[PDB]
Amino acid sequence: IRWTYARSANIYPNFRPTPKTSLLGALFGIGPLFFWYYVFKTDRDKKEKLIQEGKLDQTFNISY
Amino acid sequence: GSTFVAYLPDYRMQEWARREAERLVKYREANGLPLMESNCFDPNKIQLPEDED
Amino acid sequence: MLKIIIPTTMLLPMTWMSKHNMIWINATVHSLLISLISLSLLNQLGENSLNFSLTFFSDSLSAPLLVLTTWLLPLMLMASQSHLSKETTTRKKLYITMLILLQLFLIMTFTATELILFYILFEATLVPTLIIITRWGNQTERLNAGLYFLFYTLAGSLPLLVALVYIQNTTGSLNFLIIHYWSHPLSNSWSNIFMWLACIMAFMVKMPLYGLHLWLPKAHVEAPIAGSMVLAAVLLKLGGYGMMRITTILNPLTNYMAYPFLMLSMWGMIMTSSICLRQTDLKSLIAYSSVSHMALVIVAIMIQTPWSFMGATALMIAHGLTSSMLFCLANTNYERVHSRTMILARGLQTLLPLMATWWLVASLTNLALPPSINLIGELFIITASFSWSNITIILMGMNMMITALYSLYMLITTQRGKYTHHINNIKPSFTRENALMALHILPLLLLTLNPKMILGPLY
Amino acid sequence: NVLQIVRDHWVHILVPVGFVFGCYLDRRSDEKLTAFRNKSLLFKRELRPNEEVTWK
Amino acid sequence: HVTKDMFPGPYPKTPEERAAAAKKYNMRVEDYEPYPDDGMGYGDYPKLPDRSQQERDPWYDWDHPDLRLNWGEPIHWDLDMYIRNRVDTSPTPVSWNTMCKHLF
Amino acid sequence: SSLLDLIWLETILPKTTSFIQMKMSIMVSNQKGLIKLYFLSFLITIMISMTLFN
Amino acid sequence: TMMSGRPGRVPLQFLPNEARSLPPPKLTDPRLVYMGFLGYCSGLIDNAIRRRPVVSAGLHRQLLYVTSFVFFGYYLLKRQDYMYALRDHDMFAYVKSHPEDFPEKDKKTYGEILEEFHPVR
Amino acid sequence: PDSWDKDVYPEPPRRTPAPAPQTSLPNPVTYLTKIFDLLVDRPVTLAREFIEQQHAKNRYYYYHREFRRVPDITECEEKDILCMFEAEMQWRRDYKVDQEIVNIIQERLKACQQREGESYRQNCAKELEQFTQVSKAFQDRYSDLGAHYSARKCLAKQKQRMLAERKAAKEAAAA
Amino acid sequence: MNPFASLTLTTLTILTIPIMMSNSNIYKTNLYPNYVKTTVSYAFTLSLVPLLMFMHTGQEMIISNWHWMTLQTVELSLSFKMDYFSVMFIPVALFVTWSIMEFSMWYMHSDPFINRFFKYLLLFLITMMILVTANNLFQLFIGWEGVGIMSFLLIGWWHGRTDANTAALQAILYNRIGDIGFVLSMAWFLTHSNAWDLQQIFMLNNECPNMPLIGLLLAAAGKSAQFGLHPWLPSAMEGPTPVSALLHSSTMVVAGVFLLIRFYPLMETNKLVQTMTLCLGAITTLFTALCAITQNDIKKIVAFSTSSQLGLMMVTIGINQPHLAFLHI
Numbered sequence A: 001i002r003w004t005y006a007r008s009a010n011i012y013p014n015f016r017p018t019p020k021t022s023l024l025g026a027l028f029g030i031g032p033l034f035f036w037y038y039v040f041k042t043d044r045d046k047k048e049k050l051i052q053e054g055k056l057d058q059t060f061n062i063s064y
Numbered sequence B: 001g002s003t004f005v006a007y008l009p010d011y012r013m014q015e016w017a018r019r020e021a022e023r024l025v026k027y028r029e030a031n032g033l034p035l036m037e038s039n040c041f042d043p044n045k046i047q048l049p050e051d052e053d
Numbered sequence C: 001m002l003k004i005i006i007p008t009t010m011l012l013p014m015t016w017m018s019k020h021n022m023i024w025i026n027a028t029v030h031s032l033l034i035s036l037i038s039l040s041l042l043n044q045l046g047e048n049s050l051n052f053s054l055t056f057f058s059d060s061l062s063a064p065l066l067v068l069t070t071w072l073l074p075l076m077l078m079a080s081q082s083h084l085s086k087e088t089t090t091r092k093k094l095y096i097t098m099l100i101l102l103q104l105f106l107i108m109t110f111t112a113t114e115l116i117l118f119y120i121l122f123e124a125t126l127v128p129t130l131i132i133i134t135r136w137g138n139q140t141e142r143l144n145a146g147l148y149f150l151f152y153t154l155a156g157s158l159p160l161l162v163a164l165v166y167i168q169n170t171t172g173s174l175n176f177l178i179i180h181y182w183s184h185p186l187s188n189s190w191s192n193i194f195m196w197l198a199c200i201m202a203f204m205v206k207m208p209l210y211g212l213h214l215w216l217p218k219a220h221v222e223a224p225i226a227g228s229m230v231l232a233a234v235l236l237k238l239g240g241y242g243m244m245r246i247t248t249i250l251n252p253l254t255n256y257m258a259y260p261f262l263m264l265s266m267w268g269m270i271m272t273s274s275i276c277l278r279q280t281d282l283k284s285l286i287a288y289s290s291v292s293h294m295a296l297v298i299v300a301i302m303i304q305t306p307w308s309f310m311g312a313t314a315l316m317i318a319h320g321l322t323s324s325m326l327f328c329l330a331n332t333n334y335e336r337v338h339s340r341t342m343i344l345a346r347g348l349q350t351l352l353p354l355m356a357t358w359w360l361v362a363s364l365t366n367l368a369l370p371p372s373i374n375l376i377g378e379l380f381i382i383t384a385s386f387s388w389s390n391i392t393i394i395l396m397g398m399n400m401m402i403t404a405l406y407s408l409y410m411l412i413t414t415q416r417g418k419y420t421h422h423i424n425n426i427k428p429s430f431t432r433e434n435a436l437m438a439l440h441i442l443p444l445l446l447l448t449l450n451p452k453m454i455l456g457p458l459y
Numbered sequence D: 001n002v003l004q005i006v007r008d009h010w011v012h013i014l015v016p017v018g019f020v021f022g023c024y025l026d027r028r029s030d031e032k033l034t035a036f037r038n039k040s041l042l043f044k045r046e047l048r049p050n051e052e053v054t055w056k
Numbered sequence E: 001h002v003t004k005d006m007f008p009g010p011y012p013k014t015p016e017e018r019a020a021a022a023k024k025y026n027m028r029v030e031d032y033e034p035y036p037d038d039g040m041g042y043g044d045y046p047k048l049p050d051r052s053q054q055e056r057d058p059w060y061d062w063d064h065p066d067l068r069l070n071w072g073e074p075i076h077w078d079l080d081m082y083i084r085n086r087v088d089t090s091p092t093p094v095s096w097n098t099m100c101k102h103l104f
Numbered sequence F: 001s002s003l004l005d006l007i008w009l010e011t012i013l014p015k016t017t018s019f020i021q022m023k024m025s026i027m028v029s030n031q032k033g034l035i036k037l038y039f040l041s042f043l044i045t046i047m048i049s050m051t052l053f054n
Numbered sequence G: 001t002m003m004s005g006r007p008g009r010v011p012l013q014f015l016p017n018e019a020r021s022l023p024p025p026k027l028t029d030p031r032l033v034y035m036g037f038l039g040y041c042s043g044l045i046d047n048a049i050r051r052r053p054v055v056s057a058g059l060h061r062q063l064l065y066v067t068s069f070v071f072f073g074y075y076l077l078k079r080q081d082y083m084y085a086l087r088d089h090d091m092f093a094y095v096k097s098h099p100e101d102f103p104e105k106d107k108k109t110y111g112e113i114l115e116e117f118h119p120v121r
Numbered sequence H: 001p002d003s004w005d006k007d008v009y010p011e012p013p014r015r016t017p018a019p020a021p022q023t024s025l026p027n028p029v030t031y032l033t034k035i036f037d038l039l040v041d042r043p044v045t046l047a048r049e050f051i052e053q054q055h056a057k058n059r060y061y062y063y064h065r066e067f068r069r070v071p072d073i074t075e076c077e078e079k080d081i082l083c084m085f086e087a088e089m090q091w092r093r094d095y096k097v098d099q100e101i102v103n104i105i106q107e108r109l110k111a112c113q114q115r116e117g118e119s120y121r122q123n124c125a126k127e128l129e130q131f132t133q134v135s136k137a138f139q140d141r142y143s144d145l146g147a148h149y150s151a152r153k154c155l156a157k158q159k160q161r162m163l164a165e166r167k168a169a170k171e172a173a174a175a
Numbered sequence I: 001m002n003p004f005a006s007l008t009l010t011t012l013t014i015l016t017i018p019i020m021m022s023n024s025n026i027y028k029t030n031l032y033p034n035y036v037k038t039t040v041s042y043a044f045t046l047s048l049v050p051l052l053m054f055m056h057t058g059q060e061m062i063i064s065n066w067h068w069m070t071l072q073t074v075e076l077s078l079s080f081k082m083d084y085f086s087v088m089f090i091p092v093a094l095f096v097t098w099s100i101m102e103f104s105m106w107y108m109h110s111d112p113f114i115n116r117f118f119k120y121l122l123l124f125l126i127t128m129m130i131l132v133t134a135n136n137l138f139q140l141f142i143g144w145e146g147v148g149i150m151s152f153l154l155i156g157w158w159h160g161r162t163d164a165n166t167a168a169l170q171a172i173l174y175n176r177i178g179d180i181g182f183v184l185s186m187a188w189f190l191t192h193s194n195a196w197d198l199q200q201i202f203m204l205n206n207e208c209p210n211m212p213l214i215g216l217l218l219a220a221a222g223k224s225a226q227f228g229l230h231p232w233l234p235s236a237m238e239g240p241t242p243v244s245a246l247l248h249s250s251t252m253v254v255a256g257v258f259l260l261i262r263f264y265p266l267m268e269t270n271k272l273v274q275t276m277t278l279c280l281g282a283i284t285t286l287f288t289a290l291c292a293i294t295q296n297d298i299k300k301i302v303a304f305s306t307s308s309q310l311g312l313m314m315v316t317i318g319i320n321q322p323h324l325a326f327l328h329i
Ligand SMILES: CCCCCCCCCCCCCCCCCC(=O)OC[C@H](COP(=O)([O-])OCC(O)COP(=O)([O-])OC[C@@H](COC(=O)CCCCCCCCCCCCCCCCC)OC(=O)CCCCCCCCCCCCCCCCC)OC(=O)CCCCCCCCCCCCCCCCC
Pocket: C009, C012, C013, C016, C017, C090, C091, C094, C097, C101, C104, C127, C128, C131, C135, D014, D017, G040, G041, G042, G044, G045, G048, G053, G054, G055
């Protein structure tokens, strides 16, 4: 019971905002989102430019 | 209920569409027409705006 | 549509005038009959809709949700029969009344042809669920859980109402048919951006979207078994249905307004799945798996392609059935052990073999083993996402692997290994529990034979 | 025994009666919208010799 | 049946509450050692050695033979990470660095 | 599980809302019940409404 | 809208004479049935609060509850219908008398309207 | 079989070689097919004849539903809801028919690839060309419309394509 | 008429009757293992006939019998490819399965759940036949995942042993890593070729790009235990010896090589993927033989031998000799 309670419900009352926790939270919770946004946005911009210039060869691409 | 659902009549009209497509393909191959056409609506009834740029 | 609504209303006087020892029998029989009647809505057309009247209409998106809603009620009654044995007759009748009122509100919400009517019933579904959670919940956290489940929801839905009335002062109508036929593009403007956010956030918060999902584990672990069943199977899909309906007036803003949510989903499905790897509560694990599946549904709806919509519909139905079955299995363990901790009761395959078979089938379905409709929805969504961007496969692929892991983890911890020595009160499974699992699992494998029924209006 | 089991099983008629009443209610709604019956450009048809309405 | 005072609490700052925490977790005060009082909410919970469950004695009569646990003994914060079905930390015939160098 | 779900996502939306609403409630309701201060405030609002909305 | 100052309005008339040109609500009006249902619920709650058998304590009292609710609901429905009729009458009269504020829009056909296309990709 | 139109689903004349045994050893395949015929094909045929005569005792018909042509979206007023409803239904029916046309051509292509064997790359040129044309037309008509597709969006896409074509033609002529 | 198709479908169909009877009275008696063994021997004898027909003439067939569904322009139907590979592999698999079942009748005599064990073996055989005879990518995926689930269930046969459960989860993990590439290939082919059917994929891909072939190579490496994803095959020796002889020795682990063989028309038009396959196979066979050279458990030695042989098969695929790889299988 002590193990399950400590793992679940004793976390937040013992939480303290510190430079380490603040920095780790910012990194682990924000960095991946912007990394993936940059990756996907660059990919879709490249694809859109290729489509507008007409050089993509989407023959037989019927289902989307 | 499963038997009822299995034997539901074709109100989605799949076989009707198949028959219609068969007749269209037959007619167009018989008269040399190029199967499906690129324009969904014939341009005779569209009034484009003159740019005059 | 009244041929389904009126008998559901007649369930209430039938419940209240019933004998003290015959409430469950009558409720179960007549709920099953109502489900059989509602089965007739599945006959849909490739054309517009089944527009019964000015108030109600049915679609091939609404019909499977209605059938699932009507089918869930008898299962909830069977699941609730056990732990409500020592309860007074009046309070048992009140419990059944709450379940019936929830079913009525859901039925009407799915078939409503007006956005405002839809909003009113979509909010009316809150009161029975809140009462069920905070009255017949077991632990002391239920009160807090209820508060979360309420305010999150309301915090999302009060702006929507504003937007809705605003729309009706501009277009002149909130009827969905007129709205679809008279749609106009949304120009890129700050006012349009905030209208988009108001129309989207209420449905995002109930999916739930990653980062707005904190209410769901609380509510699902604190609710009674019927509450967990209805919350996981039907109430989550209200947001998906609403977003599917409302995205017709949000174009072409969705082309770029969808980016923050898509990321929040595509990364989010990873996080929640990984959360399932380190969980000490069964219900908490099942709830987080629900969050991952609904993140996939959010991606499907935001992509806005035919394959995306088909996959989202199929996945919604499949997840409803699977999560309800998993919650029922966890509860059948809890009623014997009274702990809700995964590693307490162990090696249960030796003591309960048929229940172990039910566990295996449920885990396989949650794992999306082909040709289950879970995998059909997942694969259609993945193909649409790949067309959206070829890089997405990476994240999608990762999720697949992780899902299998935690699914089998839950199967191995509870069913395999050695039995716990001091637990000597594990009785043979009752016919009621076995019938509950069978009635959960047979419709899924039957539906895999006719997937067109659950593929939505874009099939 | 009739007039005794009724006092316990009269409850079992409520849902089926509700179903019949709901069907009857649905029929009433249909009558109101007959504004375009046999008037659509797609299904415009000449009546049969002993036909009053195309649908009900 | 567990009382309110038998649950995990906040980080112990004084030797008296330190000794009180040690007794609550059924261990000697000399062996009790909580996690560092950082931001994360470990709190009162004791920091046990990071050894896996696989390197526990297999010839002892554990109450839970499969998990190699005894009833009442303090459970490692990461027990579900080390359950003999998962990552283990058992000593190897060859050192970790040598294995990494050879494989790479 | 711990840093994001149990701490920071909890910190951002719900806990901040609770803290702010509770602090505002304490601010608003903590009044001694003396008509002195109430009527002085009434005078201040009367002057503000006279010299701000016209 | 604010029809309080509407000319030719009697100060305390519930239903004017001109309201008699409108069809009366049917006795089987769904809103009348809902009003009767409200009266029945009031009777049941009255039974429950007074600690009496809820369904079958006072039949005369429940009948009076339902009848009073139906009576008031009928008259309320008449007044509501009359008020909406007045609103529509004034709207149409105003549109007729101000033709320069409500011009007839020159009807156009979708074949001669250029609407921008946004691909979904 | 008369159950389908031979022109819609064409097939080559199916020329097959004649048995030319070179040795005196009896091949087991022929004997196996004779015993298969005797033990399987005859009883199945007899059961089929019984079922067919039972079906002939009760003969009744069903019909293909014919649809009238209605004005399309290109001749509907801006807010005339009835005309847009009829045109939308007609456009959706046409969309389904086009999908089935593409399906027919794809079936032709797959059958050709299986039938031609090792020389499918050269002997299935016509089917590949037909599929290329039909796929191009279908992609021009219906691609990128979205999940909330409609006849108005298809008309807008066609109008933009015609504007681009007209601009390109004027630019090339005025080169 | 043309007994080829009837015979080919009858083999797979009569493989399923004991599964239906697993709820009858025969399943509760001690004659069930002999029932399953006799059924498999009869299926082998029946399947010997289409092989004779192909040997005489070269008979090849596609049977698209049941229409499952239609997503607009994509038609999904239950289709079987009865080509050289199918009609040559089915008799061999049935022969080996008959031998293994006769062996298990003696080996697992004291096992209380021997009926269940026999039933599990038949389920694996059915899934492997589905994998081998599939004509579209969805049916092939069905067989692909079925054999993996049966492998998980049969590796962890003794579920009270922690190591067996660990090995079963390990096999699932590695095969899921391969499933990522399988799903990649399916998505690419649907998006570009508008088909999961093999005929259209061959028609529309005259110069196959890198992405679908790399996905197929990832799936093959996952399921045939190539060097990156190899250890699960030696870990799979936790199961009973008949399981190790049937699934993880000769029949199930050659599924990745079979997948690469099925897509050989697209593979010969790509030189980079061929080189990748060659290098992967070479490193796999060398590393696994080197590991086998010092092992002391006999089953481990034979498992590493199987892995090295699979690497040799992939080497054969890499030098553009798919029929040689099939013969080696
Ligand atoms: C879209 C909606 C559609 C449906 C509409 C829903 C509303 C309709 C009704 C509205 C209210 C009117 C009736 C309620 C009066 C209250 C009396 C009562 O408590 O029940 C006792 C009574 C049975 O007990 P008893 O043996 O007579 O005496 C016990 C004492 O009364 C006292 O017993 P006790 O003291 O021993 O027990 C104490 C118990 C007693 O506490 C209570 O039961 C009080 C009742 C709740 C307050 C009522 C609120 C006022 C209305 C607001 C409704 C909200 C709807 C909005 C949606 C949100 C959902 C919450 O309190 C507790 O245990 C505390 C725990 C609290 C649990 C959680 C509280 C949740 C309350 C929310 C209830 C909302 C639905 C209620 C449905 C009807 C309930 C009877 O119930 C009945 O039998 C009467 C019910 C109706 C009679 C129907 C008969 C007509 C059938 C004829 C033929 C069929 C017609 C069709 C014609 C065509 C055929 C040919």
